[PDB]
Amino acid sequence: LFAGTEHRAIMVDSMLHTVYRLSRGRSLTKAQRDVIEDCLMALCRYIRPSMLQHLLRRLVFDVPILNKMPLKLLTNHYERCWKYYANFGVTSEEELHLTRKLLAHKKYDQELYRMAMETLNVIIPEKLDSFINKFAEYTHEKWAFDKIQNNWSYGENVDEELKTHPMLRPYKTFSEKDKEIYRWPIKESLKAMIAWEWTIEKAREGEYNPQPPDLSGVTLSRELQAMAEQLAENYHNTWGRKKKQELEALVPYDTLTAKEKARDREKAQELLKFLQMNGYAVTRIEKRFAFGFLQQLLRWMDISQEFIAHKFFAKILLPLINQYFTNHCLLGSGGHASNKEKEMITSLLVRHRVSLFGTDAPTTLFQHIAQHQFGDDVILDDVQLCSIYSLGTTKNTYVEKLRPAAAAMPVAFLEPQLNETKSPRERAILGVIEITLPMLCSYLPRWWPPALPAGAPPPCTAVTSLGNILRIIVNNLGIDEATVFAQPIVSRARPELLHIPTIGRLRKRAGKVVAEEEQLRLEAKAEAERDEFSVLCRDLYALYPLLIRYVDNNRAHWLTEPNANFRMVGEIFIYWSKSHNFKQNFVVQNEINNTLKKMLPIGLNMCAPTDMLAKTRYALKDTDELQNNLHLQLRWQMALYRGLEKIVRRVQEVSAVLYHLEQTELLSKQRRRAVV
Amino acid sequence: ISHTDLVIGCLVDLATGLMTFTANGKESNTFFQVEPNTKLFPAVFVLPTHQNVIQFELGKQKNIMPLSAAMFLSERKNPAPQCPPRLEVQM
Amino acid sequence: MADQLTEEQIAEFKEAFSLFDKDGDGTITTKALGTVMRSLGQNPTEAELQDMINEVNGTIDFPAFLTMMARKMKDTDSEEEIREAFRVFDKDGNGYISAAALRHVMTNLGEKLTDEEVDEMIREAGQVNYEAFVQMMTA
Amino acid sequence: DRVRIFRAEKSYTVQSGRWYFEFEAVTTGEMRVGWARPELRPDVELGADELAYVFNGHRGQRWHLGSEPFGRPWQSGDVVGCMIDLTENTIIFTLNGEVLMSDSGSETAFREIEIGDGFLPVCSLGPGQVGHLNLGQDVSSLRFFAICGLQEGFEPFAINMQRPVTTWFSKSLPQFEPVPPEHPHYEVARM
């Protein structure tokens, strides 16, 4: 019910603090604190992250430097994953703090990766006594300029209803009783500027309705803005140490609010502009993570060889998880590539997943050629260790698909692949005339292990480029028509069913469907009749064959309806009984899945309706009540369109519709603890 | 920051087409004169800066008839100020 | 209900209690209650000590001692019972119990649940895990 | 200036059946086509409030109470059909005869829409953009309706109308109007 509190944001800001004030304490048990820690994260949600940063400034002050503790880490991760689809610097400060911190070790990386997206003893110089009066005089010169604009009257006693300013005069017209309000402040700030950087000397010329001069004539440079940043924190350090001494007898500068830092910065931007007069000018994001990442990458491979010869390893595990986090969360491109080649030699699972991530995130050519040389050497060993090569055999193929989004060394491995985990060898393979001769060779083989592997890159080669691909599909057609490794065979099948040739494929696949239809009817006859498990096995094999069958049938239908909108009428009629047979058959199908039976009926529905619907409505009723004898027993706009063997064809489509129509179609409390 | 209400009243003389404007009973320097056969709508343009902004006051001065008699032909002789519901504020 | 403890604990408790019994009366001091639990290896801090005496004068009598011993061991067994309760479902013991293997283990346990409620148990909950199952049972 | 909003007259609302039209887009850019509630305010951006359902062809996203990416952006000279089926509370957008899908693969751009007072077709043209709106008087004048929509069951809009459907455009000339008493910011009081 606390959703959207733009009504009020101060009471909830105080309430959110005193809850976490009650989070750690001496006078509470495990039971009472678990109520509050569950009450806290229940309030971390159901409120907008506008008001969330009011405590997030206070948490990163306390927790992330130390390895109570989990109460911070829990509430943190439930807020940083609350907007990923000012305080940001505080988080990165905490991000490095947690890295400095890097059981309790596993309780940290989750919350971390979720956030991955002297003035009294200082001597005053000669001009510093002249600047403590001038920054007191320019302060009285700016204050009388501001108050009199809002109709501030002049009174001997300062009244608020009268807006009286009895200090409406200069510091040179003020005595020790009227300049004591600006004596210690302009002298301690000049002493704090001198104790920070010992430069108090005149090096430039100088610059009641008192008006301050144009002090904003020159802006802040790279050394002036840093000194103005040094003047705000020093004014916050002296006043902050004054608050820590007075209340004992608390907001910093860098982790200040967006509203608190707006009022504190005017005490330094006006003081450095007041110091700049009379020459007394005291003048002394992800790549940072990537720098430390490469810094960690150096010590990792150093330690990796230190164990290869025979604390940080957990930190390496802590980093790789964050590495897998940031890669998925995603000059600097080189730095990642530098780390990419850094980790690859260390391999020469957990890192490999991060390696697969980093390859998915996509000097190294030497590393590639050395790997390719190591691959062919392993291929020499394969023709004749295996674990370090097999993980490299997929990471390369990951990269070989990555860059698509040392040519000879690749070609050397290709011949080694052609020489002799056969499917994995067939996997990275696809990732001219010599191919053309082999193209007709497999075509002759289709006219009749390495036969499956050779067709992989051949599908990858023709796709890189018309009727040649049309021949390859027909070669792939008869190979399955004769027919496992049909799954990866089907993976390249839908990859290039783009580009007459379809009509030849239509005459081919119509035979493919009818053979499957006869195989379906045989199993249906087997279903009409131990032999029950065998029929279940046979249907499973039939479902297995139907899986790769319909997969090419879909994309081919994406051009058939594009064209014809005949042979498809046969193809609809053939696939009609298939869906009818699909209407225990699904039970074997579902196990084979662990669909295409549905989508086949979808594309065929448009074609079958392309060839009086009340009779179709009537014949659907008899098919929901054989009906072929019962079939024997806006329309002006429609007949304008439709005009632009019926007794069986109408009977054919009708039952298909009805099949598709069918296709689209307490305990008491003590009883619960009893059964437990 | 003024704690008082600037009241602006206008004066339109129909048989001459002469238009003048009074500021708190003190006549302003400006004036306006128009063609014979023309009409006019009373108008106020404002960018608001308060919870309560303006008030249209349909009143008469010491010897002149209010805006009710001007716009309703059945009541041209009545000097009592009225506001029937056909009158309203457009935008 | 003080029956949720077995006998030998009460045998161990009375052995511990009589060892630090003041005069054989069965009275002990407020401090000795902390020492006798640390004589039994249990180490709770003074927060878990403070709320227990005011739950029940400085004089702790043996039934007044024992009722606190029931509650300290009632809550701990109340949460560790339900993971080992899921252990008998899955053939491995991890949490992966198939839903097919449930509609005969649940109508055959002895609370006389018929087919309708073990249906009603299921469609108001493939294999389901354990932590959703301890959620759907405790409710 | 602003964006012009185009629609049909409020008599021509639909309450049932399944309907369809077509829309050629000549020069791509900022345009918007879809379906809208009849009580449509001409001040708002088309689809920002709860009165419109409208696809955007500049970057390929749907507009209703915000945005969500949807399908491919445009070319110069492609047909963007729209169709609705009130019997199932669905809205389907077809591009060039091919049915657009979501990021989840679903073709139905919006489901579970309340029928209410009805719907009526709506277009929107940004500055410079040119595109004609074939509302479907002559069936042969349509192009990609036979590819998709015909055998599905969708009838065109002006299937039996011997006169063309009158169109209502949003002006740019401001005119006076009485202040509504349910206005969220302004209110008057005749004392």
- Check CB contact of D189 with chain B, cutoff 8 Å: no
What is chain C's alpha carbon radius of gyration, rounded to the nearest angstrom?
22
Please tell me which residue of chain A has the smallest CA distance to C79. A676
Distance of alpha carbon A177 from the chain centroid: 65
CB atoms near residue A542 (< 10 Å): 22
Q: Give the start-end residues of each E strand in B1-81.
A: 8-13, 18-23, 26-33
Nearest to A372, CA basis, from A336, A337, A414: A414
Minimum-distance CB partner of A637 among D139, D146, D152: D139
**B chain contacts of residue D177, beta-carbon cutoff 8 Å:** 90-91
With H, G, I as helix, E, B as strand and everything else as coil, classify residue D19: strand
Q: What are phi and psi of D16, to 5 degrees?
A: -160, -175
Please tell me which residue of chain A has the smallest CA distance to C117. A666
DSSP notation for B41-54 = ---------SSS--
With H, G, I as helix, E, B as strand and everything else as coil, classify residue D93: strand
Minimum-distance CB partner of D188 among B83, B85, B89: B89
**B chain contacts of residue D178, beta-carbon cutoff 8 Å:** 88-91
Angular region, A151: left φ>0, alpha ψ -120 to 50, beta rest: left
- Work out the angle at residue C111's Cα, subtended by the Cα atoms of residues C107 and C116, and round it to the nearest 5 degrees: 45
* Residue A195 in tokens: 């104790």
CB contact under 8 A, D160 and A609: no
* Residue A586 in tokens: 């699904």
- Work out the angle at residue A64's Cα, subtended by the Cα atoms of residues A63 and A69, and round it to the nearest 5 degrees: 40
**A chain contacts of residue D90, beta-carbon cutoff 8 Å:** none
* Cross-strand partners of B31: B20
Distance from CA of A673 to the nearest CA of C (A): 7
Only one residue has tokens 């709508």, namely: B41
Please tell me which residue of chain D has the smallest CA distance to B85. D190
**D chain contacts of residue B52, beta-carbon cutoff 8 Å:** none
Distance of alpha carbon A543 from the chain centroid: 37
- How many Cα atoms occupy the beta-carbon half-sphere of D139 within 13 Å? 19
Distance from CA of D96 to the nearest CA of A (A): 11
Rounded to an integer, what distance in angstroms lies between the CA atom of residue A673 and that of residue A659?
47
* Cross-strand partners of D18: D85
Minimum-distance CB partner of D160 among A606, A610, A634: A634
With H, G, I as helix, E, B as strand and everything else as coil, classify residue D20: strand
CB contact under 8 A, C111 and A667: no
Rounded to an integer, what distance in angstroms lies between the CA atom of residue D166 and that of residue D188?
37
3-state helix, strand, coil in chain C (%, to 5): 60, 5, 40
Question: What are the Cα distances from residue A580, in Å, to A187, A589, A652?
Answer: 96, 14, 11
Q: Which residues contact A92 (CB under 8 A, 6 or more apart)?
A: A285
Only one residue has tokens 């400095």, namely: A100
* Residue C25 in tokens: 């009366």
What is chain D's alpha carbon radius of gyration, rounded to the nearest angstrom?
17
Rounded to an integer, what distance in angstroms lies between the CA atom of residue A112 and that of residue A64?
9
CB A581 within 8 A of CB A601: no
- Chain D: partners with 3+ C-beta pairs within 8 Å: A, B
Angular region, C5: left φ>0, alpha ψ -120 to 50, beta rest: beta
**C chain contacts of residue A28, beta-carbon cutoff 8 Å:** 47
DSSP category for residue A89: H
CB D144 within 8 A of CB D22: yes
CB A268 within 8 A of CB A232: yes
Nearest to A186, CA basis, from A120, A124, A119, A135: A135
With H, G, I as helix, E, B as strand and everything else as coil, classify residue D75: coil
Distance from CA of D125 to the nearest CA of A (A): 30
- How many Cα atoms occupy the beta-carbon half-sphere of C37 within 13 Å? 19
Rounded to an integer, what distance in angstroms lies between the CA atom of residue A135 and that of residue A215?
12
**D chain contacts of residue A561, beta-carbon cutoff 8 Å:** 147
**A chain contacts of residue C48, beta-carbon cutoff 8 Å:** 29-30
Please tell me which residue of chain A has the smallest CA distance to C138. A672
- Check CB contact of D178 with chain B, cutoff 8 Å: yes
Rounded to an integer, what distance in angstroms lies between the CA atom of residue A582 and that of residue C104?
30
CB A626 within 8 A of CB A577: no
CB B87 within 8 A of CB B70: no
Distance of alpha carbon A198 from the chain centroid: 49
Rounded to an integer, what distance in angstroms lies between the CA atom of residue A44 and that of residue A75?
7
* Residue A268 in tokens: 């330094």
CB contact under 8 A, B91 and D188: no
Q: Which residues contact A56 (CB under 8 A, 6 or more apart)?
A: A76, A79, A87, A90, A91
D108, D137, D150: best to mutate for the A interface, most A CBs within 10 A: D150
With H, G, I as helix, E, B as strand and everything else as coil, classify residue A438: helix
Minimum-distance CB partner of A565 among D139, D147, D159: D147
**A chain contacts of residue C120, beta-carbon cutoff 8 Å:** 666-667
CB atoms near residue A22 (< 10 Å): 15
**D chain contacts of residue A641, beta-carbon cutoff 8 Å:** 139, 150
Question: What are the Cα distances from residue A496, in Å, to A436, A458, A466, A509, B63?
Answer: 18, 11, 11, 17, 95
Question: What are the Cα distances from residue A522, in Å, to A644, B13, B36?
Answer: 41, 105, 102
Q: Provide the chain B residues 61-90 that lie in CB contact (below 8 A) with chain D.
A: 83, 85, 88-90
With H, G, I as helix, E, B as strand and everything else as coil, classify residue D121: strand
Rounded to an integer, what distance in angstroms lies between the CA atom of residue A33 and that of residue A477?
69
Rounded to an integer, what distance in angstroms lies between the CA atom of residue A575 and that of residue A581?
10
**C chain contacts of residue A671, beta-carbon cutoff 8 Å:** 111
From the CB coordinates, do chains C and D have 3 or more pairs under 8 Å? Answer: no
Q: Provide the chain D residues 50-109 that lie in CB contact (below 8 A) with chain B.
A: none
Rounded to an integer, what distance in angstroms lies between the CA atom of residue D131 and that of residue A626?
54
The experimental method, as deposited, was: cryo-EM
Minimum-distance CB partner of D139 among A565, A609, A641: A641
DSSP category for residue A566: -
DSSP category for residue A551: H
Distance from CA of D190 to the nearest CA of B (A): 8
With H, G, I as helix, E, B as strand and everything else as coil, classify residue A421: coil
* Cross-strand partners of B90: D178
CB A417 within 8 A of CB A393: no
CB A88 within 8 A of CB A94: no
DSSP notation for A483-517 = ---HHHHHHTTGGG----HHHHHHHHHHHHHHHHH
Please tell me which residue of chain D has the smallest CA distance to B89. D178
CB contact under 8 A, D179 and B91: yes
**A chain contacts of residue D150, beta-carbon cutoff 8 Å:** 641
* Residue A41 in tokens: 């994260």
Please tell me which residue of chain B has the smallest CA distance to D189. B55
Question: What are the Cα distances from residue D122, in Å, to A88, D36, D119, D156?
Answer: 44, 6, 9, 15
Strands D155-156 and D18-21: parallel
CB contact under 8 A, B90 and D186: no
Rounded to an integer, what distance in angstroms lies between the CA atom of residue A87 and that of residue A60?
9
User: Resolution reached, in Å?
Assistant: 3.9
CB D76 within 8 A of CB D27: yes
DSSP category for residue B13: E
* Helix (H) or strand (E) segment spanning residue A132: helix A126-147
What residue spans of chain D are helical by DSSP H? none
User: Which amino acid, one-letter code, is at A323?
Assistant: Q
* Residue D38 in tokens: 């009849």
- Check CB contact of B91 with chain D, cutoff 8 Å: yes
CB contact under 8 A, C47 and A29: yes
- How many Cα atoms occupy the beta-carbon half-sphere of C76 within 13 Å? 8
Only one residue has tokens 């060779």, namely: A441
DSSP notation for A303-332 = HHHHHHH--HHHHHHHHHHHHHHHHHH--H
A26, A28, A667: best to mutate for the C interface, most C CBs within 10 A: A667
CB contact under 8 A, A675 and C137: yes
Minimum-distance CB partner of A565 among D146, D155, D159: D146
* Residue B42 in tokens: 């009373």
Please tell me which residue of chain A has the smallest CA distance to C48. A29
DSSP category for residue A338: H
Q: What are phi and psi of C29, to 5 degrees?
A: -80, 170
Rounded to an integer, what distance in angstroms lies between the CA atom of residue D47 and that of residue A453?
53
- Chain B: partners with 3+ C-beta pairs within 8 Å: D
- Check CB contact of D176 with chain B, cutoff 8 Å: yes
Rounded to an integer, what distance in angstroms lies between the CA atom of residue B40 and that of residue A622?
78
**B chain contacts of residue D183, beta-carbon cutoff 8 Å:** none
Only one residue has tokens 């878990």, namely: C48
Distance of alpha carbon A269 from the chain centroid: 41
B49, B53, B90: best to mutate for the D interface, most D CBs within 10 A: B90
Cα dihedral angle (A353, A355, A359, A361), rounded to 10 degrees? 80
Rounded to an integer, what distance in angstroms lies between the CA atom of residue A657 and that of residue A624?
10
